[PDB]
Amino acid sequence: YTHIYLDEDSGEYLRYEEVEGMEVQGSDGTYPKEACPYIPIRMVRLDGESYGRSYIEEYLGDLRSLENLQE
Amino acid sequence: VIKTVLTYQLDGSNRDFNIPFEYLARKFVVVTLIGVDRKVLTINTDYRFATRTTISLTKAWGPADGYTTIELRRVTSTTDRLVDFTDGSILRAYDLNVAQIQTMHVAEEARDLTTDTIGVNNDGHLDARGRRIVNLANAVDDRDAVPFGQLKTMNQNSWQAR
Amino acid sequence: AIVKMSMISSKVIGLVNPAGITQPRRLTKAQTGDFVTGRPEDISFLQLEKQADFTVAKAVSDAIEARLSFA
Amino acid sequence: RSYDMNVETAAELSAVNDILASIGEPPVSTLEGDANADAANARRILNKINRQIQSRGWTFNIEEGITLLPDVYSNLIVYSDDYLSLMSTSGQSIYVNRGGYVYDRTSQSDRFDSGITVNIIRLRDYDEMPECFRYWIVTKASRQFNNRFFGAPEVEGVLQEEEDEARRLCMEYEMDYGGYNMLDGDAFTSGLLTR
Amino acid sequence: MRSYDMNVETAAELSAVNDILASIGEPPVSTLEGDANADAANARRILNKINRQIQSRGWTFNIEEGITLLPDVYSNLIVYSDDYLSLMSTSGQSIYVNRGGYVYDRTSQSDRFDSGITVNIIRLRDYDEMPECFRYWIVTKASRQFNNRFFGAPEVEGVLQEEEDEARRLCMEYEMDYGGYNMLDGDAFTSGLLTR
């Protein structure tokens, strides 16, 4: 498990690796809030929601109906 | 002089049973198998009318099942009359007699049921009318206000307390 | 309305005339070929007869779509 | 005058109505020792027609999730004569009457330990039927009584017409009662409306 | 149900007279204690039967949608009285039937109700309360039944058939005039579509 989080104080992202219960002393990297190499992605962003809303999400009804007809 | 119930006792395993009264139709004779609950036996499944006045049961229904009384009450409907008269009929004497019999059966059933009760009178008094209250064993317990016959022995004991 | 009519149309029901002699059990329990006793007229299938209403609905929908597209 | 007495209908007024279908006169008792050869016949025809109409299968008289409990000692279920029809809730029926007890065709066994759920039509009294079905039953009974015994042509024709009208009314009553919907409310199409 | 003689005669005398005339029977003037006529009671029976049938046909002026049938608070039983020609539900498939003499909820398999049910009921009402067109239709149908039960007269049967058809046409006209029934803004589905 690799977990990165905001520093509780006025700091940058803190990154560490947890394998089984305890972390590994070797992995203690710290990255700036700007150049984070993990880069979560989202296609359609909605306020509140953390992520999701694929493009095919809002055409799923058309797919449902067409598949029913074709079946 | 003949009651409409004639409550029975299983007294072991018995099948044949008798009724003292007379009914216009077997739809007006109910057999409620009381004992642990007010279990009632319907017709064709638990009933069998071998012949008139000789009602019989499918099995014994002995006390081992918790049933001790099978009172064979008689109830005549007051909504489904046996003979209803029409202005174009013949007026058979059998019709008039059947009508009077059913109405008398309904009233005699409603006079017998109500007469065996305890309740106040117009003066505001409830009287047992000299009807001994049998079958109340264990009477008392936290001052329940009645004895069950042990009073005789208790008073004999208290008489010779000395 | 049009999509729901199409969904109605998708369902297939085999209407067998009771006055006929064809029995569906021997139809079902039969492989390809396997001459069976019966008459074709006995077996009929329910259909959605609502066609003219479909045509007028399609015409109105096309007109509305055209005006909206121009808009 | 100003009272609301109710006259009998269960085999009492129906028998009178069947009798009046022909020139016959109204009886009163219908249970009198006098056999009367018309109250008995009219009652028989009325009861048979009632049983047939119930067995035809209708929305109100079909009970869906009825569970039948086998006798514990014998593990047998009695297929009573009152059970006009007995079909499984699923597509295929697997229960039939063997001797006088339910028999499972596929399993080839009538020893049921837990129970069964089946769509069952149980015979119910004539008075318990709706007005439409009561009228249809009475008309059918009158027509059959006439055709069997009196054989009056014009009465037979008019009673056939009235039987057709009564059947139409009962069918419309059933369609109104069911409220069946081919859209949501149907089995196959309700799922398709998941767009 | 009800016996023929229980109801008093106010305008049912005209209907009974018409029924008796459909066979030649001369018109009575009492329709009461002073009848002693076997062809008057046999006409009132037909009139009552036909009135019940016509009411059970389900016309819009006697559907009385929205009842609040109440149960006994100590027994929790509603009574499916014989007067209730047809008891149904405002929604789709109805769940109320008649077991014994009390309403039975087949889906719930229980006839014990706490608050009160709402139904689309057709409660029987006297022949007088029927409109004029419905009274004429009832009279014509009762006349046909009386004639073909007691006398015959095929030509009279045909004439009564034509009169019954005309009376039914008039009754249907009255029903459509009464209801209104606009398919737009009156329908339960299209009216919502016209919201725009």
Q: Is the dihedral of CA D133, D136, D138, D140 positive or negative?
A: negative
Tokens of E111: 């006839």
Q: Is B42 on the interface with D (CB under 8 A)?
A: no
Angle (CA) E52-D51-E81 rounded to 5° is: 35
What is the least distance, in Å, from the CA of E151 to any CA of chain D? 9
CA triple C2-C7-C9, angle to 5 deg:
95
Q: Do D192 and A65 touch (CB under 8 A)?
A: yes
Burial B121-152 (b: 16+ CB within 10 A, else e): eeeeeeeeeeeeeeeeeeeeeeeeeeeeeeee
- Identify the three-state secondary structure at position D87: strand
Question: DSSP H helical segments within chain B, as ranges?
Answer: 93-115, 151-159
Inspect the interface and report whether the beta carbons of B82 and D31 lie closer than 8 Å: yes
Q: Are D175 and D155 in contact (CB under 8 A)?
A: no
Give residue ranges of D with CB < 8 Å to any B CB.
6-8, 10, 12, 16, 25-34
SS3 category, D64:
strand
Structure tokens at D187: 């089995």
Of the candidates D10, D29, D32, the beta carbon closest to that of B80 is on D10
Residue of C2, C3, C8 to mutate, interface with A, max A Cβ within 10 Å: C3
Instruction: Give the whole-angstrom CA distance, residue D81 versus residue D103.
Output: 15
**Contact at CB, D28 and B82, closer than 8 angstroms:** no
Chains that touch A (3 or more CB pairs under 8 A): C, D
Distance from the E33 Cα atom to the nearest Cα atom in chain B, whole angstroms: 11
Q: Do chains D and B touch (3 or more CB pairs under 8 A)?
A: yes
D49: closest CA among D21, D87, D28, D79?
D21
d(CA E125, CA E129): 7
**Three-class SS state of B128:** coil
> Is E46:E15 a contact under the CB 8 Å cutoff?
no
In order, the DSSP letters of E78-138 are -B--TTEEEEE-SSSS--EEEETTEEEETTTTB---SS----EEEE---STTS-HHHHHHH
Radius of gyration of chain D (CA): 21
Burial of B106 (0-12, 13-18, 19+ CB in 10 A): middle
Cβ of E8 within 8 Å of Cβ of D1? The answer is yes
Least Cα distance to B28 among B83, B95, B79, B73 occurs for B73
Give yes or no for a contact between E151 and D154, defined as CB atoms under 8 angstroms apart. Answer: no
- What 3-state DSSP class applies to B88? coil
Cβ atoms of D48 and D72 within 8 Å: the answer is no
Q: Do A68 and C7 touch (CB under 8 A)?
A: yes
D7 chain-B contacts, CB cut-off 8 A: 84
Q: Which residues are registered as beta bridge partners of D78?
A: D101
Q: Inter-chain contact D32–B81, Cβ cutoff 8 Å?
A: no
Residues sharing a CB contact under 8 Å with residue E174, sequence separation 6 or more, in sequence order? E131, E133, E134
Quickly count: other Cβ atoms within 10 Å of residue E149's Cβ: 21
Residue of D nearest to C48 (CA): D182
Resolution in A: 3.2
Contacts with C, A 47-66, CB within 8 Å: 65
The single-letter code of the amino acid at E194 is L
CB spacing of D182 vs C8 below 8 angstroms: yes
Q: Are B21 and B2 in contact (CB under 8 A)?
A: yes
**Where is E159: in which H helix or E strand?**
helix E154-179
For residue D60, the SS3 value is coil
Which chain C residues are closer than 8 Å to A65 by Cβ?
3, 6-7
Of B157, B139, B156, nearest in space to B148 by CA: B139
- A57: nearest CA in chain D? D195
Residue D144 CB neighbour total at 10 angstroms: 19
CB contacts of B88 in chain E (<8 Å) are: 38, 41-42
Please tell me if residue C12 touches chain A, with a CB cutoff of 8 Å.
no
Q: Where are the alpha helices (DSSP H) in chain D?
A: 13-21, 39-55, 131-145, 153-178, 187-192
Distance CA B119, CA E65 (A): 47
3-state secondary structure of A30: strand
Q: How far apart are CA D132 and CA E43, in angstroms?
A: 22
Rounded Cα gap, residues D24 and D152, in angstroms: 13
Q: Which of B152, B150, B148, B153 is nearest to B137 (CA)?
A: B148
Chain D residues whose beta carbon lies within 8 Å of the beta carbon of residue C3:
195
The set of chains that have 3 or more CB pairs under 8 A with E is B, D
Contact D192 A68 (CB under 8 A): yes
List beta partners, residue B69. B34
Whole-angstrom distance between the N-terminal and C-terminal Cα of chain C?
Answer: 24
Q: Which residues of E touch D (CB under 8 A)?
A: 1-3, 6, 8, 42, 45, 49, 52-53, 56-58, 82, 85-86, 88, 91-94, 97-100, 106, 144-145, 148-150, 152, 154, 157
Alpha helices in D22-149 (DSSP H): 39-55, 131-145
B81 with D8: Cβ contact below 8 A: yes
E43 Cβ neighbours under 8 A, 6+ residues apart: E16, E19, E20, E142, E146
Taking an 8 Å cut-off on Cβ atoms, the answer to whether D20 and E2 are in contact is: no
Q: What is the rounded CA–CA span in Å between residue E90 and residue E86?
A: 13
Phi then psi dihedrals of residue E65, to 5 deg: -65, 140
The tokens 């498939």 sit on which residue? E93
**Contact status of D1 with chain A (Cβ, < 8 Å):** no
| Tokens of residue C57, six digits | 């609905």
Q: What gap in Å lies between CA A53 and CA A60, rounded to an integer?
A: 11
Contact E28, E37 (CB under 8 A): yes
Residues in chain C: 71
